[PDB]
Structure 1
């Protein structure tokens, strides 16, 4: 089972690199399974994105560089959480398409927020059923019209720090778009040339 899967992965990567002479090395950041599925369905007819074990990728391409040279140039660059994007079209189309299909990731418990989000002094819009959470986070409010209205601005969280568990749910209930991050291309490999 395991050895069969590894051999099948070797076969898949070698046939894909043979089919597409030009490919990108792409950084798989903290993108969810749904985000990988949506980029897969976005390039369902454009190109192919292939991930897996870097230790396997290095070994297979080093063992089967013989049928096509200039494959060794990708070796010192496939490090960390990286994968391949074998393509037939140009660079710009795939580049700006995978930069275009961004997905906003909501902050959760034990999360890092590179972006700053600030609560406004605007009506929440729902019933007064989050007063306990508002008082826990410290935002003292007023009650009117069967809803909740924020009476002041509060610096909710800073940039690149730790977000609290009783603060992530407050951001979720207020429905503010937090820091977002998608899929970024490490570099581009065109038949023997490497570019940004």
Structure 2
């Protein structure tokens, strides 16, 4: 089973790289299976995306390189959680749509947040039975029209710090836009060419 799986995978990779001459190597950050399905549906119309084992990738593009030259210069660059998107379209048309269809990922517990966000002073809009998280975090909230109101601006998160469980559940219930990330292009490959 495993050997047949790997052999079929090798055949798929070699036929795909022979069929499609233009491919962008793209890094995968902390992305979900729902995002994978969404990207698959949104991209399967015009191009294809490939995201598997890096050892498989290097072995396929190295051992069977004899069919076409000008390929070994990808080898010292394919590292990390990366894959290949194969397209017959052009760089701008792929890049703008792939940079636009970024799902707003939430604040998962245990995830680093290089970006910075800050909650403003606005009504929560939820019932006044969730003051426990605010009081545990140290947030001054008072009753107003049967809703919870943030009377003062407070520092929520800084850059490059761990997110606690209380902060994560607060950002989950707040229904706001937290720091988000997705599938980001590392570099390109158009018939033997490396750019941004």
Contact 1:106-1:178 within 8 A present in 2 as well: yes
Deviation, structure 1 residue 117:
2.1
How many angstroms apart in 2 are the aligned matches of 1:185 and 1:144?
Answer: 47
How many angstroms apart in 2 are the aligned matches of 1:6 and 1:35?
Answer: 25
- CA displacement, residues 138-182 of structure 1 (integer Å, 9 cap, x when unaligned): 102111322111111110111111111111111111112111111
Deviation, structure 1 residue 119:
2.1
How many angstroms apart in 2 are the aligned matches of 1:65 and 1:31?
Answer: 31
RMSD: 1.2
Deviation, structure 1 residue 120:
2.0
Deviation, structure 1 residue 102:
0.6
- C-alpha spacing 1:193/1:118, structure 2 compared with 1 (3 Å): closer
Deviation, structure 1 residue 84:
0.8
Tell me what 1:163 maps to.
163
How many angstroms apart in 2 are the aligned matches of 1:78 and 1:116?
Answer: 30
TM-score, normalization: structure 2? 0.95
Deviation, structure 1 residue 36:
1.7
How many angstroms apart in 1 are the aligned matches of 2:76 and 2:194?
Answer: 12
Question: Secondary structure of the equivalent of 2:49?
Answer: strand
- CA displacement, residues 71-117 of structure 1 (integer Å, 9 cap, x when unaligned): 21211111111111111111111111111101111112222122222
Deviation, structure 1 residue 133:
1.2
TM-score, normalization: structure 1? 0.95
1:76 counterpart = 2:52 = no
Deviation, structure 1 residue 12:
0.6
Contact 1:50-1:84 within 8 A present in 2 as well: yes
Question: Secondary structure of the equivalent of 2:162?
Answer: strand
Question: Secondary structure of the equivalent of 1:119?
Answer: coil
Query: Greater strand share, 1 or 2?
Result: 1
How many angstroms apart in 1 are the aligned matches of 2:182 and 2:188?
Answer: 18
How many angstroms apart in 2 are the aligned matches of 1:117 and 1:187?
Answer: 28
Runs of at least 5 residues in structure 1 that lack an aligned partner in the other structure? none
Deviation, structure 1 residue 52:
0.9
Which shifted more, 161-170 or 109-118? 109-118
- CA displacement, residues 4-59 of structure 1 (integer Å, 9 cap, x when unaligned): 11011101110000000111111111111111221111111211111111111111
Which shifted more, 5-14 or 182-191? 182-191
